[PDB]
Each structure stands twice: as C-alpha cells, then as structure tokens.
Design a protein around this ligand. Sequence first.
Ligand code: ZN
Lengths: 596, 195
Amino acid sequence: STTEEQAKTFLQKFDHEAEDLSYRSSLASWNYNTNITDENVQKMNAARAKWSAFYEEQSRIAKTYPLEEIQNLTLKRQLQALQQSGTSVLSADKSKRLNTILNTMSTIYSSGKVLDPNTQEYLVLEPGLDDIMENSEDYNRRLWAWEGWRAEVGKQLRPFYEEYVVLENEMARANNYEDYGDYWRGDYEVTGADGYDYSRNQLIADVERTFAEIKPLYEQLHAYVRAKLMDAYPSRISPTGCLPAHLLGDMWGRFWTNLYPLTVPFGEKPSIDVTKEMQNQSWDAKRIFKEAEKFFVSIGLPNMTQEFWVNSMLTEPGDGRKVVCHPTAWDLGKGDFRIKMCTKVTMDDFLTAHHEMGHIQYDMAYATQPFLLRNGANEGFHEAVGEIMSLSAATPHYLKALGLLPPDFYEDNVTEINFLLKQALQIVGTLPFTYMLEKWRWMVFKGEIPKEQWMQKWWEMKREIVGVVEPLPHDETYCDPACLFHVAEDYSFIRYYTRTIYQFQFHEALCQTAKHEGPLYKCDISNSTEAGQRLLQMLHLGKSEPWTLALENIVGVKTMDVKPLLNYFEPLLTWLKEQNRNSPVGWSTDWTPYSD
Amino acid sequence: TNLCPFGEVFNATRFASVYAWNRKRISNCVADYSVLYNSASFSTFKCYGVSPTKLNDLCFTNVYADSFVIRGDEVRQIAPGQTGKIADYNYKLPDDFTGCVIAWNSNNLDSKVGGNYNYLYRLFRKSNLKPFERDISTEIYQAGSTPCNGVEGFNCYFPLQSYGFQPTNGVGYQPYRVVVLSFELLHAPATVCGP
Ligand SMILES: [Zn+2]
C-alpha cells in the first residue's frame, strides 16, 4: 500500500499503546506529588521509564516513513511530532553524559544554600531567601541574599553549563539544527502551509520587532519605579542610572510585583481585596472552584467533569502527607483532568483558580484530537489561555457581580491606576527580563558570545535591554543566568514572552466580540457567550493546525502583535507620562553602584 | 419455570471481549420488558424499530442477546449506519436491524487499579466486518508488502489490542457493558411470545 496507508495504520497502533503508557506514568507522578514516599518515587521512575523508552523506539520506526509521501494535512502533523525526537541522535556515551550534567544542575539549584549572620541556618531558596527578597527593604540584607545565592549556585553551575552548551549543540547539529537555540525555536516553526509559513529565524524577527514597541512603555514604568525606589533607598540609586538587581523585589528580578508597596500610586486608597470578604460569607475551599466553574459556564465553556471533583486535591488534606502544593493542572489522559492546589482561601487563590481551571478548559477542548496532536498550537498558547481568565476575574466588575464587593462600590480613577500599575509590574515588567534572558541563551548557543565573555555580555545586555545594573562586579567564575530555575533545568524561556503577547491579542479580540464599551482593562467577558464561541474556535484546534492559523481564528492576524498590550496599558501610560515630567526617563549604562 | 434468564446474561460475573462477543439463544421466556425499561441504572437505552412503550402485543420467533465491554465513547458507534473501529471491525449492525440496545456504565466492576487488560478489541482488519459477523482469528495484520511470517514486525501488527480500564478514567474511557437484543421474524412455532 501507499505510505499514507502504511503510516495511518502505524499511527493507530501507536495511539493505543501511547494513550495507556503515558497515562500510567501520569498516574505515578500524580501519586508521588499527592503523597511523597519512598515507594512512590520508585514507581514514578519505573513507570516513566517505560513510556520514555516506548516513545523513542516508536520515533525510530516513524522515521522509516518518508514525510514527503504523505498528502494528508492531519496525518503529517502527527508524523512530524512523532519523528522529531531529541537526545536520541547522540552516542550512548554522550547521551549518558548529557543526563549526568542535566541532573547535577537540577541538584545544585535545589540544594543551594547560603550563610546567614545567624550562621547555623543554611537558608534554602524556598521557604527562605524568597521571603528575604520578596518582603524585605534592607539594602544590605538583600545584597547578601543576591550575591550569596549567585556565589554558591552560580559558581558551581558554570563548569557544568559550559559542557551543557556543547553537548546540546551536538544533539541539535546531528538533528539538522544550527544550534540548541534553534531547536527551541522549532516549536514555532511551520513549514507545510502556504501563507501560514513561520520559520525558526522569523521568531527572532518578531520577538525583536514586538519589543521595539514595549520599550517606550517600559521606559515610563522603569522611570516611575526608579523614582519611587530613590525615596525608599535614599542615596542608593542614581536618578539617571540603572536599577540595582537586588532591589527589584525578587531573587532574579523576573517580576516586579513585590515592589508594589513601595510604588503604590495612591497610598491612602487601599487595593481591591476580597480576602476578608470571602471569609465573612463562609466561602469554603471548594466554593472557589464551584464559583470559578460558573465563570467558564457563563462564557459557554463546558462544565468540569464529575470525576474531576472527586479525584482533585482541592483542599489540603489533614493527614500528614508531604504534598507538593505547587498549583498545577494535570492532563493525565484517558479523559482524566485534575488540578493540584491546596486551597488556603484568599483573593490570590481566587485569581489562580481561574488560571488553572483555564488550563483544563484548554486541555478538555482538544481531547477529541489525535493523541499526538493534543497540546497547545505552540508553547505560548497553553499558558496564555489561562491568563486571560485572570484578567477577567481580577476586574472589579466581575467581583462586584458575584457579591464580593458592596453594591454601591465606586470605581474612581485612583483605583483604576492602582490596578493597572499592579498589572504592569507583572506583565510589562517581566518582558525585558524574559527577552534579554532568552536573547542571551540564543547567542550563547549560536556562538556570538565567546566562552570568555559569558558574564560580560550577560550584564551588557541587561544594563542595555532590561535597565538593571550589577550590584557587584561579577567575573567569568559566576554564572548568574544559571541561578534561575528555568536556565538550570533545560527549560525554554521564550514561552513567557510570547505568552504575554498572546494574552492581550486574545483578550482584546474577546472583548471586541463581547461588545465592550470602554477601556480594555475594565472588560469582563463573563456572561457573554459570544466570547466563548470564538475562544473555543482556537481551543478545539490544539496542535492539529499551525499556530499562525489558530491565532487568526480568534484574533484575526497571523503575526505576533503587541498593539493590544499597549491598548490595555494605555490609560496607565498617560498617567505615567504625567508623573515622570519632573524625573529623567531612560538609564545610563556608565553608572554602577560599585564604582564609588 | 418459564422465567426468562435475563439475570444470567445481564448480571454475569464476567463479560466477554468485544471481538469475541458471546451469543446466547434463549427460549421459553416470559420477559418483563418493564423492569429493563424501568431499571433506572442503564446509561444508554436506545431502541431501534420499537417504541419505548410496552408493545407487548407483537410476538417474535426468537430473541438473541450479545454481550461485550466496549469503552464509554464507543457506545455511539453501535447503531444502524454508524462507522468506527468497533462498528466496522468488531460488531456491525445492519441498516435494517430490528431490536433494542441496552448499555450501562461498568466502572468498579470491569475496572481495577493498574488496568483490567483482559478485554480485547480488534483494531486492524483487512476489510469491514459483515453485519452480525464474528471473528476470532489472530493472524498478524499485514500493512505493507512484506511477509509477516506470523511475527510482529514492521507493518505487521497484532490485530487484537487490550483495553486499558483504570478506575480513574473519564466517562468516555470507562468500561461500558452493553447488551444488544435482536428480534427474529420467520415462520416458526414462536415459542417466545409476549404476554
Ligand atoms: Zn499555567
């Protein structure tokens, strides 16, 4: 028979075994993450080993089928996902070596600890130095936590990361890729459609084209934050200089959310919080998810399954089991979707029960697609669908309707700029960090950054792109980027940049379909069924169709566009351009805190 | 003495595989169609050619019952005119089928921790199965133009595959015991007549 019939039969054979081998591994990771024990970790590794071995050996068989001999669009995308494997193209010695390096890095990061003035403490990252970084405002103590963590983890990871780069550049080149920074950009590659073709070198073009418009908005926010930090830290920051890294409200500076108390626009007016209000109405740990479901039902999305409630750990169990309480959504397979979050009922646990319940709605939508095509269209669509639910659930209009706010609640311009500035420290304050970090790793893999200039080009870019200056001079011995969780465990970081761009392309499109009359930050897609019949036209597609086509179905354009993001923060930008009239805008790379 | 052995077929301890669907020809039956209709425990109860009303006036020559455990989402595939892996390769109903189809969820009965892989279904077949046909052959399916020689190789896969029935799956991926009742009409003494 033809290759199409010989591969369609093969994919049917793969699906039956894969749909029940990955599920058994998914029912072992879940059990370990819901009950940590010595036997569970053994079962988790044993189950995943069978699936890992099965997936690679099936990929080798799939490569025997010529891809060009398949004339079915829905069949090629499954072969592409199946054939395009990784780490199986290296020698058995090097493949063993790569996992040895990739496991030491994930061990040094977790085991990192630093010395405290109370010497016998050995503070771990979490809980620990995170509390120091996210809550303290002491210049001396934050500098010790910043430099200390990079002294321990950074120095140790540097010899391993230098061998991580070369080994990952041998797997990529053997797999017909330029560099390991080209393997990561292959998630955004479409090479089968006409008029929907996206190359691996066009992502760099769009990432650097959408960042040339964020910069005018980021400069105003950076100037305003810098002005407020001078009040908090007198004689510590130059008025026209860059921001020291340890003063960004985080260990690395990814999110500026912890700079809100210092940078409240209207300090007298409190923020809109319903933490106390929910407790007054006897809101249980399950009432949040029941109310969160009512939001997705209002827009027309399907209800959560009956098995979801029974099998999900919505509340912290009383039994002393070591539950990993990282809030995550589980796509186990076989029609089983679960959310792992120990509810500690609080406003932030009401705005993160719409993001995890927005990952399931995305997972439930493409459950009818073939097993290989069960995932986001790209790596930036699965984390962006959940976030647009947080935008709708954070608006005062949504909270007021549910009854968590008084019926006579008055929305003044004071609170409008307090909410927008709290979203800017998270949405538009992470893009320069996310863009610079991925741009650094891309050039390191490419070769534009020699072995002797890793920490010279890391801070030259950060002082130029991010506007963050070194608290202390770091030589080649340190490895500052490796201290981040994603860098040290071989995880891509351009997922969090495209996600933010897709957040508001989806949000603006849904609000336009929702007949929203006014600003884009007050939009609440709740009770609108025309914003759930257009969002679901991209959710159902999954990975079957190119992300460019999926993007056009909901938004209307085939290209990454940052124009909706600026419209969301446009009311804030006008206020930011009137509060920075008496303060300089921009940063000078020359100034350094350690110069004096 | 004349009680219909519905309990033997509708409440057996263990059902048969989809491809090896059991057929039982039952005679001398005073059938209480009401208890089947009023069971209030059947997930899917679709009857083709017979109204949900009693309709006990008509008599039939004989009644056939077929037993198997298909997945939950595969119940839709069993109907006149439907197509699918179960319909085309395992159990096909003719377009002129006259009978009643009874299905109910079988979780906690055919499911266990680890997976109840005993049940098997036919995934690959050379041609579409005829209506009311049964196949038990274990010959290796040949997808390519190379001799399989009775061993699982490239383009040579075993036609039978094992259902994975976990107790935590969704309603689609959970075992569903289905019993199909057929109505035989021809010139005969018609031992089984409705009251
Ligand atoms: Zn997420």
